[PDB]
Design a protein around this nucleic acid. Sequence first.
DNA 1: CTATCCTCCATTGTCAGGTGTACCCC
DNA 2: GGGTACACCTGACAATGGAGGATAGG
Length: 298
Amino acid sequence: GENSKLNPWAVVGFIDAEGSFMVRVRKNSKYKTGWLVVAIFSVTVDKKDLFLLESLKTFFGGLGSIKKSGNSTFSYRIESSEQLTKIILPFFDKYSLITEKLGDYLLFKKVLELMGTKEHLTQRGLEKIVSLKASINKGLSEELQAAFPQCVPTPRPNNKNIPDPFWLAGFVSGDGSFKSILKKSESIKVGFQSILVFQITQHARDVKLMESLISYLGCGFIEKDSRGPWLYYTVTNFSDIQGKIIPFFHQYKIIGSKYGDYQDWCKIALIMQNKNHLTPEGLNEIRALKGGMNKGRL
DNA sequence: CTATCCTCCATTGTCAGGTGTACCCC
DNA sequence: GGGTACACCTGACAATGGAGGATAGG
Ligand SMILES: [Ca+2]
């Protein structure tokens, strides 16, 4: 992959799920103020999905660079402030993020506006720029909080509607899951219950977004993780899966290697619709599918 | 001295893959 | 007497989200 098309909204949504907007503040005395301020737009994915990055680079007029990142990952990064301001900002202005990522990108925009007028090289301009980063991402880490302990983080912005179905496709490609389970049953003639599940995981920040999905897809529910601020919107109900989840993502296809999961998922869902899952032969047919899907892919 | 390229982490939070059992269907 | 769905449980390793450098230009 390298070409494709990518739906503007698919892209936005995918980014709402997987993207980072980074405003980095480096110590270097060779710089007038004592600091280098760099601004980055990053996406990072498994070797599985290098071709997505490629198609993403393409989508953004061919800008940026695709590079080995971690042991098993690759990264697509726009690091040039000009390039960012020229390609990235106008896009995301028109086609707004709807996660709390919007909030990140919005701050990100101001730094790239300060850096634009060159006020960042200036002193107090930096101070403003750090007040921004303060409320971005994880926030300040050690050195930043130490060199700048006097910094009042700037106010975080607010609102939350799904702009387009394709947004959800894209978004789900990032932070969504098509689970297949085999639960050891003690009341079935083949010994195991076959369960399909559809999941979307997300941080409790976006509780309001997630809550809405139930309304949006006309099914599902939200469970909080016992151990943190992790929401799972979930659909376990077979009839809903077959009549709402599948037809949706059939129409608004999944972008990435997860698409291939959705397919094998559907392939099971047929085998379940025909009651063949209570046979040993069709149960087997399932094991193979699931075995070679998700964490066991390629 | 400022801007972009570039090659490298570490930590922990998603994904993903399971249960315990209320309850509907025969 | 066979089969389903919600609520709940739980861990590994990729996704966060960085970290320096080396440049080449003004
Ligand atoms: Ca994420």
